[model samples]
Target: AFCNLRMCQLSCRKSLGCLLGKCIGDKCKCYGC
Candidate 1:
């Protein structure tokens, strides 16, 4: 299993306009991108 930071960042940024901060357990939290 790979955690793609870039993909998460882009996805969150695109979807919620938020920046990916860090992954907590099974979730990736975000702020302002």
Candidate 2:
């Protein structure tokens, strides 16, 4: 996994079931509410 922070934010506004989304080396990590 290798991605930019912006990529995550742009692609991951609300992912999976998370309130927010983030990126970890391209792994669009999801944040909990």
Candidate 3:
């Protein structure tokens, strides 16, 4: 699961968006922080 990944661009824009953000690829990939 996504643990230490940084917040995504889309998430950072929202007021209460996902802090951890969504996975990279369309298949939910982890790129690391």
lDDT of each: 0.61, 0.60, 0.39
TM-score of candidate 1 versus the correct structure, residues matched by position: 0.37
Kindly give the number of clashing pairs for every candidate.
0, 1, 0
Q: Rank the candidates by lDDT, best first.
A: 1, 2, 3
Model 2 spans with C-alpha error above 4 angstroms = 14-22
lDDT by residue for model 3 over 13-32, one digit each (tens)?
Answer: 44344343355553233223
TM-scores of the models, in the given order?
Answer: 0.37, 0.38, 0.20
Assess the local accuracy of residue 24 in candidate 3 as a C-alpha lDDT between 0 and 100: 52
Sliding window of 10 residues with minimal summed lDDT for model 3 = 24-33
TM-score of 2: 0.38
The C-alpha RMSD of each candidate to the native structure, in angstroms, is: 3.5, 4.3, 8.2
Q: Mind giving the per-residue lDDT tens digits that candidate 2 earns over 1-33?
A: 347765566555645556365656557777663
Q: Could you tell which candidate, 2 or 3, scores higher by TM-score?
A: 2
User: Could you arrange the candidates by TM-score from highest to lowest?
Assistant: 2, 1, 3
Q: In model 1, which residue pairs have backbone atoms overlapping below 3 Å?
A: none
